[PDB]
């Protein structure tokens, strides 16, 4: 019952079943009629949609999940290498924007979790800076999808897929990706794993559970869960729900002195609908359901202050960006070792169909914190032989993020061919002095003295997979002895514990 | 206001009135304290007690606190250079053992806090080591009082006094000392400040708060709070309290297959009593009150597993050691940046007076963790002129250990006379490679490879005082901007930031 995990089981094989035991599972009883026809594949099956001119779908495609139904409620979902929704075809056609900017390649206007550390983010524009300087790297946005471009980077660093699993009985695809600081070269590490569950629950409804796992040392306090939006030319009409289940046209459009619509979710009916136009209840539509409850009492230990939505067509009707942004935002603390989740729904149908399904399902949204127990967590064995006998035994790792345990990753130096395992995602990663963009007289000047940037995106190191978690404490009991992983290492070039991880990690003793 | 702190204000002056704001001030619901019955002095006033034959009380004396009362409740407390109680005279005469062993000079059988890192401590004797090897330095015990001797060291390194303060309205003497690894030459740094408050609360009761401030990188998980005990020839009768308030003679004596009495504190009534004999309720006595509550649920985040006492006469009635050990032991984690305290009481009177007073006061014992806030913390100015203009401005430091802030120490090279300030207590300290005492095939061999010992006791450097704390983060607001201390240094021989402290310490910018 401790299965072997081969280190070269690629996450793309979608076999990592035990790595998702901690994702909440929703039982609908007889509320929803399940799907009788769902396909899933990782074979390359491109959308045929129109994209920004430099883009090639082979660079982003990961998987395709399709709900095969009637003409109104069929939907066709394509997941990218960052675990993001980069293409989503419904009765209105392609609903994901084209990614018209050459430097933003399916990493911004795509459906994805995003998280911000407000204490560290700096959104200063370039006219706050000294002459000739730029604001590169100052912002702290960890994108689920991946990075913007930078010099020498021709396509994005998509958030590396670290594990994945397709459950054919459940009709659910699970992905875990290491989220990427989007603004390159970043001043900051990412200590966020994004786990997302995509499930065909029937009736044209897609159930998506966004999990944000903070294994780093920063506090995230601004969550886009999700960030995304729609292709404006496919879905030009914008509607918000109201308490009681009616819908109202909304008009928010970004421009001078206008950031669009913004309201707390308890001012809504739990959802928005984008439709081909605003003229007909039969117009093809996409609904996004985020619920209508802000449970400030229950989450007061995490300072949940509000949950709100934004909606805005970006610019005018001919903007080549062809993007209407939408986001659900949670203002809540996700501290180191916290794991937050939020379950939302995407619905495909006519506007009338979507409104009825959204009124029915919005009560089923939930969010909260996940704390897996050891007793409910599987283990896997990593074979010493596959690590070139770098240990004096095989080792066992947990496959759920029990509070405080430390993820262990398989990485490869692409120039030397050396493969190794480490908790340290930044071991041997290129860093460089940061060019302080501020004048000496700026209040912000001292913040950016003696800083470095991290170049983990530059291809020298490839991130292969998550192998499991090592306990941060001695779990010795009457059944099993534990010892420090340090005591087992024969070849510290293959099992790499850098200074901050010395004498901290425990595994069963053979 | 931000007062000046002269770098020539010796801690021995007992004037450091703002360095103790973080010590819990106990407010009593029923106890009434007198205000005309306490003396304090740092004038050399020796005890006249009999000590080990090589000892000179001038080498240990720091200060004297005396409670003026009747013949039963008068007590006379002498604090040593390490902040320890080295002499404690009551109705039974001298209560502290003589320190009969030449290598243990008021550093063991004295009342003191002691802390152990179980992760690092190794108590192996020479029998476990290779032929010619020694176990010197393998143990990890940070004594409040000071070090044992070693070849080349004629009197101890007493834990350097960093700050002290007598408040004549409160009748309380506060010391802060830098605890010493007692087993020399040590493999380990000390990252512990011990702050102890000695407060006369009247009628023979002395209130003592032991504060353990972990500013290092180890985890302490075995705390003697206190370690100490009594002079057996003065206090030969040993009693433990029981739930309900009665007392019982105990018999624990060290010897073959016997380490004395050991019980969880909730098996007691909250105290022990040592008395001149066991024959009469009028016998002169010393009570030590440690409480009877083990709050495992409340402290579950700190892994409080047990609190227990030990008591043992060391050897037979004619042992020249003339020592009955006593200690309260807390098994709890004090992690890096934690500050733990435990308040206990010493009571001087007849046995029956001590029992009555202890039954009443045992409910006032408490322990916990301290997290000082900026709002409750004072600041001081260190004058650039006093540092030979080594900076380009005067600097301000905090006088409480707000979590994460870095203490700054004044130190002196005894060869050159040069004084300097640094957070690095081991700057310029002589180190020597550690001879691995284990055979190559021992499971402990790798642990002791590539190790050094620290000779901070060798007289090269003298530790003068704690000047305050620098913030570990930028505290800039609308009024005062903060800068890196690095930016202010003109003479890096007088203000010393070594590699691990570069670009980390923030102070107000002038």
Cα Rg of chain A, angstroms:
23
Place of tokens 């040069």: B418
**Smallest Cα–Cα separation from A267: which of A285, A250, A286, A287?**
A250
Buried b (16+ CB within 10 A) or exposed e, A33-50: eebeebebebeeeebebe
Task: For A98-139, give the DSSP string.
Answer: ---STT-SSSSSSBEEEEE-TTT-----GGGS-TT---TT--
C-alpha–C-alpha distance, residues B144 and B228, integer Å: 11
Could you tell me if B385 and B363 lie in one domain? no
Q: Are A118 and A103 in contact (CB under 8 A)?
A: no
Q: B474 and A446: CB-CB below 8 Å?
A: yes
Q: Tell me whether residue A8 is in a domain.
A: no
Say yes or no: A119 contacts chain B, CB-CB below 8 A: no
**What are φ and ψ of residue A386, in 5° steps?**
-75, -20
Q: Are B278 and B239 in contact (CB under 8 A)?
A: yes
Could you tell me if A326 and A432 lie in one domain? no
> Taking phi first (over 0 means left), then psi (-120 to 50 degrees means alpha), and beta for anything else, what does residue B98 get?
alpha
C-alpha–C-alpha distance, residues B295 and B366, integer Å: 10
Buried b (16+ CB within 10 A) or exposed e, B380-407: bbbebebbeebbeebbbbbbbbbeebbb
Asked if residue A495 has a cis previous peptide bond (ω within 30° of 0), the answer is: no
Tell me how far CA of residue B366 lies from CA of A422, B62, B291, B344, in angstroms: 43, 28, 8, 8
C-alpha–C-alpha distance, residues A182 and A161, integer Å: 16
Say yes or no: A37 contacts chain B, CB-CB below 8 A: no
Closest Cα in chain A, distance from residue B488 (Å): 12
Cβ atoms within 10 A of the Cβ of A26, count? Answer: 14
Q: B487 and A450: CB-CB below 8 Å?
A: no
C-alpha–C-alpha distance, residues B122 and B103, integer Å: 20
Resolution of this deposited model, Å: 1.6
Closest Cα in chain B, distance from residue A473 (Å): 11
Q: Tell me whether residue B54 is in a domain.
A: no
Q: Tell me whether residue A44 is in a domain.
A: yes
Alpha helices of A116-226 — where are they, by DSSP H?
Answer: none
Residue B414: both structure tokens together: 């005894």
> Can you say whether the dihedral through the CA atoms of B462, B467, B471, B474 is positive or negative?
negative
**Smallest Cα–Cα separation from B401: which of B334, B496, B495, B466?**
B466
Instruction: Please give the distance of CA A190 from its chain centroid, rounded to a whole number.
Output: 12
Residue B499: both structure tokens together: 């590699």
C-alpha–C-alpha distance, residues A402 and A472, integer Å: 10
Q: Which residues contact A46 (CB under 8 A, 6 or more apart)?
A: A57, A58, A61
**Smallest Cα–Cα separation from A228: which of A107, A349, A62, A67?**
A107
Q: Are A362 and A270 in contact (CB under 8 A)?
A: yes
- List B263's β-bridge partners, or say none: B309
Q: Tell me whether residue A15 is in a domain.
A: no
Q: Which of B487, B489, B499, B505 to mutate to test the interface with A (most CBs of A within 10 A)?
A: B487
Place of tokens 């209840």: A281
Residue A478: domain span: 374-508
Say yes or no: A449 contacts chain B, CB-CB below 8 A: yes
Could you tell me if A442 and A323 lie in one domain? no
Sequence-ordered strand ranges (E) for A147-305: 161-167, 172-178, 180-181, 192-202, 205-214, 222-230, 237-241, 247-249, 253-254, 261-264, 271-275, 284-289
Task: Specify the CATH number for the domain of residue B358.
Answer: 2.70.98
Could you tell me if A401 and A482 lie in one domain? yes
C-alpha–C-alpha distance, residues A223 and A298, integer Å: 18
Q: Are B121 and B220 in contact (CB under 8 A)?
A: no
Place of tokens 């009681």: A244
Q: Tell me whether residue B201 is in a domain.
A: yes
| Pairing between β-strand B366-369 and β-strand B379-382 as defined by DSSP bridges | unpaired
Say yes or no: A446 contacts chain B, CB-CB below 8 A: yes
Residue numbers in B near A446 (CB within 8 A): 474, 476, 481-484, 487, 509
**Smallest Cα–Cα separation from B241: which of B221, B267, B217, B220?**
B267
- Helix/strand/coil percentages in chain A, nearest 5: 10, 40, 50
Buried b (16+ CB within 10 A) or exposed e, A231-265: bbbbbbbbbbbeeeeebeebebbbeeeeebbeeeb
Could you tell me if A163 and A39 lie in one domain? yes
Could you tell me if B32 and B162 lie in one domain? yes
Place of tokens 């006998």: A389
Q: A450 and B502: CB-CB below 8 Å?
A: yes
Q: A443 and B476: CB-CB below 8 Å?
A: yes
Cβ atoms within 10 A of the Cβ of A440, count? Answer: 9
What's the start-to-end Cα distance of chain A, in Å?
17
- Helix/strand/coil percentages in chain B, nearest 5: 10, 40, 55
Q: Which residues contact B282 (CB under 8 A, 6 or more apart)?
A: B350, B351, B352
**What are φ and ψ of residue B267, in 5° steps?**
-85, -5
Residue numbers in B near A472 (CB within 8 A): none
Say yes or no: B509 contacts chain A, CB-CB below 8 A: yes
Q: Tell me whether residue A14 is in a domain.
A: no
Q: Which of B474, B479, B506 to mutate to test the interface with A (most CBs of A within 10 A)?
A: B474
C-alpha–C-alpha distance, residues B218 and B142, integer Å: 12
Tell me how far CA of residue A374 lies from CA of A471, B71, B185, B296, in angstroms: 10, 61, 42, 21
C-alpha–C-alpha distance, residues B219 and B260, integer Å: 28
**Smallest Cα–Cα separation from A268: which of A306, A295, A241, A293?**
A241
Tell me how far CA of residue A328 lies from CA of A115, A264, A360, B492, in angstroms: 12, 9, 19, 52
Tell me how far CA of residue B344 lies from CA of A287, B73, B87, in angstroms: 64, 18, 18
Place of tokens 């007062």: B3
Could you tell me if A79 and A215 lie in one domain? yes
Q: Which residues contact B333 (CB under 8 A, 6 or more apart)?
A: B219, B220, B221, B302, B303
C-alpha–C-alpha distance, residues A374 and A395, integer Å: 17
Q: B509 and A446: CB-CB below 8 Å?
A: yes
Nearest CA in chain B to A483: B119
C-alpha–C-alpha distance, residues B467 and A38, integer Å: 70
**Smallest Cα–Cα separation from B325: which of B278, B279, B386, B261?**
B261
Place of tokens 């060869």: B415
The last residue of a domain, from among A343, A369, A395 = A369
Report DSSP state, residue B255: B
Q: Are B247 and B287 in contact (CB under 8 A)?
A: no
Asked if residue A226 has a cis previous peptide bond (ω within 30° of 0), the answer is: yes
The last residue of a domain, from among A369, A388, A418 = A369
Residue numbers in B near A449 (CB within 8 A): 484, 487, 503
Say yes or no: B489 contacts chain A, CB-CB below 8 A: no
Residue numbers in B near A487 (CB within 8 A): 443, 446
C-alpha–C-alpha distance, residues B471 and B382, integer Å: 15
Q: Are B311 and B241 in contact (CB under 8 A)?
A: no
Alpha helices of A123-213 — where are they, by DSSP H?
Answer: none
Residue numbers in B near A443 (CB within 8 A): 476, 481
C-alpha–C-alpha distance, residues B308 and B330, integer Å: 7
Task: For B366-432, give the DSSP string.
Answer: EEEE----GGG--EEEEPGGGGTT-BSS-EEEESS--TT-EEEEEEEETTT--EEEES-TTTT--EE
3-state secondary structure of B301: helix
Report DSSP state, residue A173: E
Q: Which residues contact B301 (CB under 8 A, 6 or more apart)?
A: none
Could you tell me if B138 and B275 lie in one domain? yes
Residue A267: both structure tokens together: 């001012």
C-alpha–C-alpha distance, residues A110 and A227, integer Å: 7
C-alpha–C-alpha distance, residues B114 and A211, integer Å: 44
**Smallest Cα–Cα separation from A486: which of A500, A468, A467?**
A500
Nearest CA in chain A to B219: A504
> Among B482, B503, B509, whose Cβ lies nearest the Cβ of A450?
B503
Residue A13: both structure tokens together: 């094989």
Could you tell me if B348 and B449 lie in one domain? no
C-alpha–C-alpha distance, residues A333 and A336, integer Å: 10
Say yes or no: B331 contacts chain A, CB-CB below 8 A: no
**Smallest Cα–Cα separation from B230: which of B268, B198, B273?**
B273
Q: Are B271 and B292 in contact (CB under 8 A)?
A: no
C-alpha–C-alpha distance, residues B320 and B109, integer Å: 13
Cα Rg of chain B, angstroms:
23
Instruction: Please give the distance of CA B391 from its chain centroid, rounded to a whole number.
Output: 33
Residue A166: both structure tokens together: 């397709």
Q: Tell me whether residue A4 is in a domain.
A: no
Q: Are A242 and A248 in contact (CB under 8 A)?
A: yes
3-state secondary structure of A59: helix
Instruction: Please give the distance of CA A135 from its chain centroid, rounded to a whole number.
Output: 24
> Among A446, A487, A503, whose Cβ lies nearest the Cβ of B483?
A446
Chain A residues 247-266 with a CB less than 8 Å from chain B: none
Residue B26: both structure tokens together: 């106990």
Cβ atoms within 10 A of the Cβ of A389, count? Answer: 12
Residue numbers in B near A450 (CB within 8 A): 484, 486, 502-503
Could you tell me if A209 and A253 lie in one domain? yes
Breaks after residues in chain B, judged by C–N over 2.5 Å: none
- The structural domain count of chain B equals 2
Could you tell me if A357 and A398 lie in one domain? no
Residue numbers in A near B486 (CB within 8 A): 450
Q: A446 and B119: CB-CB below 8 Å?
A: no
Q: Which residues contact A483 (CB under 8 A, 6 or more apart)?
A: A506, A507, A508, A509
> Taking phi first (over 0 means left), then psi (-120 to 50 degrees means alpha), and beta for anything else, what does residue A434 get?
beta
Could you tell me if A325 and A406 lie in one domain? no
Cβ atoms within 10 A of the Cβ of A276, count? Answer: 21
Report DSSP state, residue A485: G
Closest Cα in chain A, distance from residue B302 (Å): 13
Q: B443 and A487: CB-CB below 8 Å?
A: yes
Q: A449 and B482: CB-CB below 8 Å?
A: no
Residue B214: both structure tokens together: 């972990």
Any idea how long chain A is? 510
Nearest CA in chain B to A442: B481
Q: Are B325 and B96 in contact (CB under 8 A)?
A: no
Q: Tell me whether residue B49 is in a domain.
A: no
Closest Cα in chain A, distance from residue B503 (Å): 7
The last residue of a domain, from among A320, A354, A369 = A369
What's the start-to-end Cα distance of chain B, in Å?
16
Any idea how long chain B is? 510
C-alpha–C-alpha distance, residues A2 and B12, integer Å: 62
Q: A449 and B503: CB-CB below 8 Å?
A: yes
Residue A154 CB burial class (10 angstroms; 0-12, 13-18, ≥19)? exposed
Cβ atoms within 10 A of the Cβ of A88, count? Answer: 24
Q: Are A179 and A135 in contact (CB under 8 A)?
A: no
**What are φ and ψ of residue B485, in 5° steps?**
-55, -35
Closest Cα in chain A, distance from residue B506 (Å): 10
C-alpha–C-alpha distance, residues B59 and A510, integer Å: 53
Q: A503 and B119: CB-CB below 8 Å?
A: yes
- Give CA torsion, residues A236, A237, A238, A244, to 10 deg: -160
Q: Are A144 and A194 in contact (CB under 8 A)?
A: yes
Q: Are A376 and A23 in contact (CB under 8 A)?
A: no
Q: Which residues contact B499 (CB under 8 A, 6 or more apart)?
A: none
| Pairing between β-strand A141-143 and β-strand A112-116 as defined by DSSP bridges | antiparallel
């Amino acid at each position: 019952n401790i299965e072997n995990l081969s280190i070269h089981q690629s996450p793309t094989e979608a076999l990592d079943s035990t790595f998702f035991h901690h994702v909440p599972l929703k039982d609908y009883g007889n509320l929803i009629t399940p799907s009788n026809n769902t396909t899933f594949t990782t074979n390359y099956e491109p959308s045929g949609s129109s994209w920004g001119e430099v883009l090639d779908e082979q660079n982003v495609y990961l998987a395709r999940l399709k709900h095969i139904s009637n003409s109104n409620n069929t939907w066709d979902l394509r997941i990218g290498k960052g675990g993001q929704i980069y293409s989503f075809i419904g009765p209105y056609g392609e609903g994901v924007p084209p990614s018209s900017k050459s430097h933003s390649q399916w990493n911004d206007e795509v459906w994805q979790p995003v998280s911000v550390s407000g204490s560290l983010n700096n959104g200063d524009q370039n006219d706050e800076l000294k002459e000739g300087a730029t604001n590169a790297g100052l912002k702290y946005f960890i994108h689920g999808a991946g990075t913007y471009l930078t010099e020498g980077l021709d396509t994005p660093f998509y958030s590396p897929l670290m594990a994945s699993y397709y459950n054919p009985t459940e009709k659910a695809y699970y992905v875990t990706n290491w989220g990427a600081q989007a603004h390159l070269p970043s001043l900051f590490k990412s200590g966020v794993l994004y786990t997302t569950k995509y499930k065909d629950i029937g009736e044209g409804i897609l159930e998506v559970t966004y999990v944000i796992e903070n294994f780093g040392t920063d506090t995230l306090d601004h969550l886009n869960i999700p960030w995304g939006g729609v292709r404006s030319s496919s879905l030009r009409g914008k509607f918000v729900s109201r308490p009681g289940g009616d819908i109202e046209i909304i008009y928010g459009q970004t421009g001078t002195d206008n950031a669009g619509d913004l309201e707390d979710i308890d001012a809504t009916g739990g959802y928005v609908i984008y439709a081909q136009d605003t003229l007909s209840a039969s117009s093809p539509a996409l609904g996004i359901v985020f619920g209508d409850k802000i449970l400030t009492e229950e989450f007061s230990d995490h300072d949940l202050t509000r949950i709100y939505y934004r909606s805005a067509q970006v610019g005018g009707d001919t903007n080549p960006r062809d993007y209407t942004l939408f986001t659900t935002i949670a203002k809540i603390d996700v501290k180191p070792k916290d794991i937050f989740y939020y379950r939302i729904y995407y619905i495909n149908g006519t506007r009338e169909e979507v409104q009825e399904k959204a009124n029915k399902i919005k009560s089923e949204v939930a969010y909260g914190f996940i704390t897996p127990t050891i007793e409910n967590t599987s283990m896997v064995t990593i074979k010493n032989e596959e690590l070139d006998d770098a240990l004096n035994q095989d080792i066992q790792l947990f496959t759920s993020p029990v509070k405080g345990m430390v993820p262990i990753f398989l990485m490869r130096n692409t120039t030397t061919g050396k493969e190794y395992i480490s908790p340290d995602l930044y071991y041997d990663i290129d860093t460089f002095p940061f060019s302080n963009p501020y004048e000496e007289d700026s209040p912000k000047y001292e913040t950016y003295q003696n800083r470095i940037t991290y170049r983990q995106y530059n291809g020298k190191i490839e991130y292969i997979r998550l192998l499991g978690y090592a306990s941060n404490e001695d779990l010795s009991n009457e059944e099993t002895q534990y010892t420090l992983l340090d005591n087992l290492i024969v070849d510290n070039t293959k099992v790499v514990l850098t200074t901050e991880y010395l004498n901290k990690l425990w595994v069963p003793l053979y």
